[PDB]
From a paper:
Vanadium-dependent haloperoxidases (VHPOs) are biotechnologically valuable and operationally versatile biocatalysts. VHPOs are categorized according to the most electronegative halide they can oxidize, leading to chloroperoxidases (VCPOs), bromoperoxidases (VBPOs), and iodoperoxidases (VIPOs). The general mechanism for VHPO-catalyzed reactions is based on the two-electron oxidation of halides. For elucidating the halogen specificity in VHPOs, we chose the vanadium-dependent haloperoxidase AmVHPO from the cyanobacterium Acaryochloris marina MBIC 1101721.
Mutagenesis experiments in the second shell combined with activity screening assays revealed that R425S-VCPO was transformed into a chloroperoxidase capable of efficient aromatic chlorination, even on a preparative scale. Strikingly, the conversion of 3 by bromination and chlorination drastically increased from 53% for bromination and 8% for chlorination for the wild-type AmVHPO to 91% and 74%, respectively, for the R425S variant. An isosteric phosphate, obtained from the reservoir solution, replaced the cofactor vanadate in the enzyme crystals. Both mutant structures feature the identical characteristic assembly of a hexamer of dimers, arranged in a “head-to-tail” orientation with superimposable key catalytic residues when compared to the wild-type. In detail, residues 390–404 in the wild-type structure lack a defined electron density due to flexibility. In contrast, in R425S, this section consolidated in a loop structure, strongly influenced by the introduced serine residue (highlighted in blue). Remarkably, variant R425S showed an interaction between Ser425 and a region of the adjacent subunit (highlighted in blue). Exchanging Arg425 by serine organizes residues 390–404 in R425S to a defined loop. This structural variation has no immediate influence on its protein subunit but causes mutual interactions of two neighboring monomers in the ‘head-to-tail´ orientation of the dodecameric enzyme structure. Consequently, the loop triggers the formation of a defined tunnel with the vanadate cofactor at the end. Although the key catalytic residues in the first coordination sphere of cofactor binding are still strictly conserved within the R425S-AmVHPO mutant, the Ser425 from the adjacent subunit alters the hydrogen-bonding network within the active site, thus forming a tunnel protecting the vanadate in the active site.
Residue numbers in the entry:
A (entry chain A), B (entry chain A), C (entry chain A): 1 to 639
D (entry chain A): 1 to 29
Write the structure that this text describes.
Amino acid sequence: MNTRRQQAQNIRNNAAELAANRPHPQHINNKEEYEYRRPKKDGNEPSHIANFTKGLPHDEHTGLLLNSADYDQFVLGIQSGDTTDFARTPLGPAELPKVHGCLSKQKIDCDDDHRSGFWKSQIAQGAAGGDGAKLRAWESAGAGLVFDLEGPDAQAVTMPPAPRLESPELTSEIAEVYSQALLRDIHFSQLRDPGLGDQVNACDSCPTQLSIYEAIDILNTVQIEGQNWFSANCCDLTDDEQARQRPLVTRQNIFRGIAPGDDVGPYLSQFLLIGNNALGGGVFGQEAGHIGYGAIRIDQRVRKATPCKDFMTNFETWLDVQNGADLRGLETYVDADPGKCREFPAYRVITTPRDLATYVHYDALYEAYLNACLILLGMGAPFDPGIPFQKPDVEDKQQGFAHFGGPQILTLVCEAATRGLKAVSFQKFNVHRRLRPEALGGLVDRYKHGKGAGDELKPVAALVEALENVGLLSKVVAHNQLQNQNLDRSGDPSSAGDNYFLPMAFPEGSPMHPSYGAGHATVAGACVTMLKAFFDHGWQLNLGMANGKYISYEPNQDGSSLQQVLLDCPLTVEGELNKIAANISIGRDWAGVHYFTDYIESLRLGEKIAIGILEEQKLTYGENFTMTVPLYDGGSIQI
Amino acid sequence: MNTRRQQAQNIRNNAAELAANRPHPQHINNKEEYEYRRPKKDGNEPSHIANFTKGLPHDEHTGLLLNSADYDQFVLGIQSGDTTDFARTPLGPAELPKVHGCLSKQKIDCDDDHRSGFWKSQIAQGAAGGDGAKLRAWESAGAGLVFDLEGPDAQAVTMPPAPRLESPELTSEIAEVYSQALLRDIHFSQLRDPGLGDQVNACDSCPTQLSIYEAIDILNTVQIEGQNWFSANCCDLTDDEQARQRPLVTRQNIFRGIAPGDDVGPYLSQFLLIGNNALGGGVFGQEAGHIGYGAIRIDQRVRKATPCKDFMTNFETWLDVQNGADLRGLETYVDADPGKCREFPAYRVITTPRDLATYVHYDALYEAYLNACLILLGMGAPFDPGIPFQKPDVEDKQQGFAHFGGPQILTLVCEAATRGLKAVSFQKFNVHRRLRPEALGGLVDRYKHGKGAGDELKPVAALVEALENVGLLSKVVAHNQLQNQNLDRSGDPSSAGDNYFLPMAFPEGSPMHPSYGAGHATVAGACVTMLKAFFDHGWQLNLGMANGKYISYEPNQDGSSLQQVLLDCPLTVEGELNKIAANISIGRDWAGVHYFTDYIESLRLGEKIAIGILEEQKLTYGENFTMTVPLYDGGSIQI
Amino acid sequence: MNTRRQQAQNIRNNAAELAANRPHPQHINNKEEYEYRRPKKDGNEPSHIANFTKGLPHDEHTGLLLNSADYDQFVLGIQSGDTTDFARTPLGPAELPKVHGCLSKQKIDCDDDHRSGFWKSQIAQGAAGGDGAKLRAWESAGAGLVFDLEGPDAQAVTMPPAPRLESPELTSEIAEVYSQALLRDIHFSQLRDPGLGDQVNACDSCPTQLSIYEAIDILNTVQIEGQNWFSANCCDLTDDEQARQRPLVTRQNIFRGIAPGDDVGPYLSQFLLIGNNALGGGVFGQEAGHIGYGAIRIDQRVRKATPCKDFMTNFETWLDVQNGADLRGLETYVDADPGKCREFPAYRVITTPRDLATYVHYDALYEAYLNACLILLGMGAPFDPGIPFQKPDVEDKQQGFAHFGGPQILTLVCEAATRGLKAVSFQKFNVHRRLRPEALGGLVDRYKHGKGAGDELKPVAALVEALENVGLLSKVVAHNQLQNQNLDRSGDPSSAGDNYFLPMAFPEGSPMHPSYGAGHATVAGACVTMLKAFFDHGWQLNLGMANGKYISYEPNQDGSSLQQVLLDCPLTVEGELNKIAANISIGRDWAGVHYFTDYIESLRLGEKIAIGILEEQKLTYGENFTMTVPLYDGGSIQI
Amino acid sequence: MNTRRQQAQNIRNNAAELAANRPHPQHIN
Ligand code: NA
Ligand code: NA
Ligand code: NA
């Protein structure tokens, strides 16, 4: 034998070696960083239009990257991770220097207690009780360089290159993210084939410049050089692009993930609507929406944000956000009705993408995937049959709580997320640095106003044609027109003119870190993979059945209760975990802060992080069991 | 430089070595295992009265360990961890073999679909809809042998020896756990010095055979060989016992933990009563009891179990539980009132120890410590000033989300718990194997009925004197008398006679694993230590103040809302985290499944697990910061 | 220099490291294991219909997996490899326990000398001279966990996921394996384009419900969701499926392998028909069928099993086999004719798939590939020109016998096979666990009798449609009708009704180990790869030529002698080795125990095992030569 | 536990050492 000290050290060294001896891939970007250029005096420099520049100095007149030297310093700081190198990077509004090639001078500083004059938008000017908005910096840029004790390393795993401005793929994606902004107040029952059950309209009537029927046509018709993303055959596409590729847009498969079981049933996953039966003697049912949080409850009702109230719809509002104006918590929320119980309608069931965007806005990491984990445990969901002490207590003479029970999975959903964020943080900051969809909506507008210098915005030219030739932009300007009649931005100079800016559900828009690699989807992919591994992924949810059809749940007209939907086949653990993975992941896309590529490839990156942890932790147990974890790309694996 | 693969492997090897090079202590029990004996034909064998035997065959007539060979096989199985060795261990009721020294024969098996006849209690006989209760086995016995990737090893950390039946310490502890059973329906406002604010009685009037005033006297007067635990000076006590030692019992310090800040304010920690202010525009306040779970809410109202309804109050009910009768979920809960909102009183505020016992009954691991973590984040609580990117965004030009924000602490509270359970699982199963307080209540009764053989129960003799000489038992028999008038156990033969059994708030009583080392307290200690480390432990909670006194919260008469309590000094993050640590940890003691020693030493074991993880994870970051984590034993440490 | 001891140790350490430093792939199944479910009381459990359950307890009334707990114990035993864990797994017929979730009780045991009453089929009831059939257990389940001194490790190599019940691929495969059962007595001259030479009918006239012309149409027309396997373009298929994919079924390419040279010439490889010229002075020719086994001969005539006599054609016969009834050697064989020499027709030339099924039934591992090796050596076949001492003896002054002659290759064909079996044993038992084609024929029948519970056999529904819509099943029931008129199973209750069971050429059917990964094909692929490596793969076989056409051999009407076939081009060593690889590998498929996927992917797995050994053994020799081993997937490699 | 790769390599190294640690005789004509 060996002393336990040695055995414990050996296993931690074996896990460390196992992690190292796996395939360490090479990180390949789409080369957009230094490809698209613009003009300087007696030469040319890169435009960095296709790069994330949110927080840096943007020209206050043109809304383009003010100084390229700022981005070169921003990039430098990312790779070093030195706190000192962050401090040299200019932030928010700035003045271009008198000597060319030098770093920009930051207008706002520590002695600026009153910051009203620096911003050009009314909202930002009187944001902090009349003082004016504050600067906000980038979030955990050096997290990609942070190591970990378990799972694969952040740079020991990679995502494929982001699609380009010239590509047919991106054109379909920006159109999809654009469409969702105009379809942001649609009732969820509309996002599915009408044969399943009766659909309804959102009780709150909003001005709509786009419907579902139109959106499917636009997404199917949108094309570059006579090629549509959904239409294009395999032969044309690259091995990387062949993987992401989706089919022709259907009422059922619209705005949905490509993970198995996403198509089956309604849009919204049960684990975002249903709860558990009341502890002990049942006072309420699963349709109540109270999760069985041990002896206390979880309310499944999200905070209701005032419908059809999108932000950054004009240039000033957009520019100030892109100049790192801290506008968090300036979005308004519907007040409660004294007559009604359970703080309705202040807190209602997630009825529209807006309410998903709101849920996802403050989601707080792994909440959604823990909640789903809690729901299954309370329901009486079985664990993967490979796991020890799973048989009747009399026969096996052991139950298993500490390491093969609820306790182990409760920690695992939470564990994985942290490793997830670090892994994607590298892909965002140190590799791809893809612009936010809000920025592309920026690029689209500025081009249509003939802004920039020379052939700077020529790359975007191809993109805006398809968006206008499908007739989408014409509806976006109409939607924006009505949004700029709001008193908060009515007097903004840009409100009078046309705006092609993609509406943001949040005043601040996207978080202060690059687009490519989604923080929500990476956590979603990782946390869900752990749940699918541990639980019996096939387990058909016993939500009950009526009239020989297995019942499901979607919200009612005002989200006051759940409307039952009756399907031919029952819902499985796998599908609903994959659906809530997709719901939260695409939940950002509805808010207009992510593309589909950000979701899909993050979900694939997420499972690699999660699988790696499970692989490494298997060295510890001497029971010698098997955990069968299903993947999003077809067949399952045996850990 | 080195390639990232090598650096990542080196850090995981360095963490593994750091863990090994720390002090690996030697595990010392109190030698009770094979000390107390009883008689066999022409010799003597150990009684195993002071050991955990719950689940094994107990003699149906005497309620003592039927065969010592069963315990020797039970012990053997623990140390091996072999699934086959578990299967040989007899469970529940059994028949003593015709040849002596041989293993007992199990009555119940896989062909016993109807198990009514095997049980001697009415409740268990008609438990499973008339079929009869099923056998339940021991929970994760082999978890002590499971290794881990981060933190200290389970056998690389130890707890001091459990107190003995002869000791003054245990006598005070069993009296404390006994008292709590009779004080189980007391309103929490009573568990504090009355000078702070107006106290109240529980709206539900229960027959009480013991009051607070009496309980303090009993705990202060109870003594062995003219020595009281709280009275005894340092000189008399051992270095291990000097640490646990508490002061003379006060109205303020009664049934409370010895962690700093437990004495200050009411009994119940705020993080078990208060919530967050409503997201965005405030529709309700913190006194509401809705935690700011991102965009959804957490209900702080526990399920209300029918008051003054304790179980295992007679021999039959006690014996069947001790014979591993699965009675989970047979406890009844108060129905809701249609007229009232928020499912009242079915779901009410934690008003009595019963409601804490109920909360803790299904607590689901780290819920309480995550909830507390969520509350602080929503409040706007500051992190430990050592942590990077903590200064204004403009100055430092970075915020930190992924690794130095909410995300990192959210995973850490959840992370630590799993490592905690494995560490204590060893101390329970492989080392101390201390009997449950319910078992000691068993030993007390059987002695007072002159059960057992020869000088078997002589060890307990000394214990029962002090309990009777304080006049406690006389009140326990009176409490039990009224409890056995219930129709569910009225017709049980033992109901007619006197019962000295400690009432259990759960029908099944303690979980199927030994007493010493508390699973709740180990998680509590570990999770709270992580919170204290990350957050500014000193941060005075801004709950508001009225009349120049800082306001606090305790429940009202029916737990319909929070009653404000006004203190001279404000509550700190440290104290309330230490109080919720103690609340949940002692929450078991109220249910009657743990002693104080199980709490205190687990809280100390818990922080060692947590600190060890933090120490190891510090190798990853290159920022070079400092986390100042305060300890329960005075001064703070710098990680 | 180094001492030889050190050099010898270094090379064995270098080989060990080389093996480890190669790509270790991750084992991915199709997730069918826990996907398809059925109903239990108040819940749902997995059906394990798509898993190998042969030997376990099958319900005697429905013919489905009796208890899922048995499979969970069966799986557990596989992964542990513990002899004790095998013994707990119930075998053959069993009684479902009174408590649910418990292990089944085995009817047959060691005190059952007379086992007539346990079986439901006449054949099995009077199998062991009236005593009744015995139980048979699973074959080398723990061989996947066995290590090796040379070649790649069993878990250091993997096969792609098995096709699913829903898939178009499987539907084409089961139709192919079904067709072969009805075409089992076809003369081999029919399995090729008729332009090559005159075709003939099997002298023994059997009732045929299917012809070649019909079988090609059925295989080309069979489709799922309007998709045929052979018709489907690359774009639709996955990278794994794109590899297996075959072209539209031709008279030449029907039931043939996709290895280069399989299409060229007749179906049956020469090395299964031809022999060598008589040692010294030629008394007979190559058309004789006597292999030059040094100074003795090998008879190429297989034992003739009585034609059109298939087994397990009814439910009882099928069920008893699936309940592990040991029926080995109950198949009857044609008696010899006293008048004729060389024990004819008792021993005849392999004339029909039946005779191949019979050859392959007792093939005894590597016999076929050694025989082929012996034939080439006797013919005067050249070795790969890279090998040392290959030139005229006078010039080079060395011949090479021990290490570069016959001796080295003779051991290599035999060597590789053992490593092959262990490698695939893992893929069968520990990963894929694909049901046998006989089991799917079982699933098809039970569905058509409306057996099982709820939506248990719904997965198979899609499969049986295509089989009936092509009109195949209608012919299978007709074939089965005539087979159940046999007196051995005439009185079996199921004989009266319709049977859709795929006929088995063996009474026992498939061997006691899962379908996916073929033991014959893995050995075939491995052994043939070694032969192709060593010999000059291109070497055009000098069998002679007549009328300016290179002669070949196929059998005559009664397999009394070889009928010559004249082709435009000569046969190469590569093609005929690939053809005998395919012949033996597909030889199982004719018997109805394997699919095409089992052959193709095993042949690819086989070469990886073989190449790995050759790579490792190259460290030993200091001659520094090159062995050019051709692959089945196009180009050759240089070892 | 160890990863199968390591266990498989260790056994092949153990076999190689076992072979070397046996009596290596001197060849006398
Ligand atoms: Na169990
Ligand atoms: Na900050
Ligand atoms: Na030669």
